[PDB]
Write a protein that binds this ligand. Sequence first.
Ligand code: SF4
Ligand code: SF4
Lengths: 62, 62
Amino acid sequence: GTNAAMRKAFNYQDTAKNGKKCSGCAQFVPGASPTAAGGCKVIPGDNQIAPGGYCDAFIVKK
Amino acid sequence: GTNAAMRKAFNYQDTAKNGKKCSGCAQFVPGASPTAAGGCKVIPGDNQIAPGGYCDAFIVKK
Ligand code: SF4
Ligand code: SF4
């Protein structure tokens, strides 16, 4: 399932934005494997977050 | 929202069981902060899973 509202609020996209992507973001909750879709701490109920996606809420992880 | 049917299936509770709680479970999908409600792989369509809750499907995260 996806959280359409939130994805739209953050202008989520399935592709990276100039090297910026979910897999390198502090909010990402990775799936069972690298290429698996995961979750996001700020997009509740969404389990279709692509590791190579991106949104306005991105924050480089440490 | 919550998924009352799935919560009932796994005997979800809002408190921990012998120290076991959602925030320490491998099926948990954390919310924005460690204390915010999150999601769970075993209770689809529920975004009100308490980090201090528990269910029979608990599995320690390693
Ligand atoms: S905040 Fe945006 S960039 Fe970061 S993991 Fe969630 S969807 Fe991806
Ligand atoms: S499986 Fe049960 S204990 Fe684990 S996160 Fe889901 S509700 Fe909580």
